Amino acid sequence: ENPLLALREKISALDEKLLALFAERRELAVEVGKAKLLSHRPVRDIDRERDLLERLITLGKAHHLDAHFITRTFQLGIEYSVLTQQALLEHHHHH
Amino acid sequence: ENPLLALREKISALDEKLLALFAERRELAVEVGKAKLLSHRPVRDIDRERDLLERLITLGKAHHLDAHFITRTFQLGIEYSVLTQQALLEHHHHH
Numbered sequence: 001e002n003p004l005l006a007l008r009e010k011i012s013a014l015d016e017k018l019l020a021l022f023a024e025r026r027e028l029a030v031e032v033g034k035a036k037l038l039s040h041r042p043v044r045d046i047d048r049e050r051d052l053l054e055r056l057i058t059l060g061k062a063h064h065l066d067a068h069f070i071t072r073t074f075q076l077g078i079e080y081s082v083l084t085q086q087a088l089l090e091h092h093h094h095h
Numbered sequence: 096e097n098p099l100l101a102l103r104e105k106i107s108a109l110d111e112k113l114l115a116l117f118a119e120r121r122e123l124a125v126e127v128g129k130a131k132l133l134s135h136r137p138v139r140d141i142d143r144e145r146d147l148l149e150r151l152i153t154l155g156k157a158h159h160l161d162a163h164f165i166t167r168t169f170q171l172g173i174e175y176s177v178l179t180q181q182a183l184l185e186h187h188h189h190h
Contacts, residue, residue, distance in 0.1 A: 003130045011123050015151060015169075018116055021109055022168075023158040028106050035098045056110060063118040066175075073117075073171050074110070080164045081106075 025077065026084055033085030037092060043085045049078050120172065121179060128180035138184045144173050 036043060053074055060070040131138055148169055155165035 002134075004127065004134060004136065007123060007127050007130060011120065011127070014116055014120050014123065016154065018113065018120075019151070019154055019158055019160065019165075021113055021116075022155070022160055022165075025106065025109050026160060028102055028109065032099065032102050032106075035102065039099070041099070056114070059111060059114055060117075063114055065114065065117055065121070069171065069175050070114075073168065076164060076168050076171075077110075080161065 022077075025081070029081035029084040030088060032081070033088035036085065037089055043082060043089060049082075052078065117172075120176065124176035124179045125183060127176075128183035131180070132184065132187070138180045139177060144177070148173065 033043070035041075053071060056074045057067045057070050060067065128138060130136075148166065151169045152162050152165050156162060
């Protein structure tokens with residue numbers, strides 16, 4: 001009974017759930033972009049971004065996840081949300 | 096209400112679920128490392144890592160998630176799992 005096969009299948013299941021949450025996070029970024037456009041609020045606030053990241057680092061430490069790994073991972077997520085919101089603004093200004 | 100406040104709270108809930116899955120993924124990495132040691136597979140398999148990443152990119156595209164974002168995010172995740180498995184092999188000094 002090769003125990004590696006069952007473990008790799010559980011990791012694949014976990015990775016599919018991560019992708020589904022990434023997709024949901026992107027839908028939310030679109031909604032944020034829309035609300036900002038309706039509210040005339042800018043996309044970027046680098047103080048907001050940095051404070052968000054500090055909070056994620058603290059929540060991560062409760063799970064014993066390395067601060068550096070959390071920083072790098074969530075910097076990607078924040079950047080992707082911002083790119084998504086900016087692309088939304090940019091599309092509607094092309095009219 | 097201010098619709099941005101509800102959206103940012105849903106994004107925070109989503110980020111807490113991501114952290115929980117990151118934690119679970121790390122526990123699984125430890126189990127994989129153990130099983131490899133018991134099975135005499137080497138701790139690193141760079142072909143496995145590269146093939147996994149390609150699969151995740153394709154599953155991501157089905158969710159309309161950018162390939163570059165997927166690539167960068169899962170490169171971090173895979174590296175984190177691998178460092179964990181290597182540390183377990185190295186701790187075989189104590190074992």
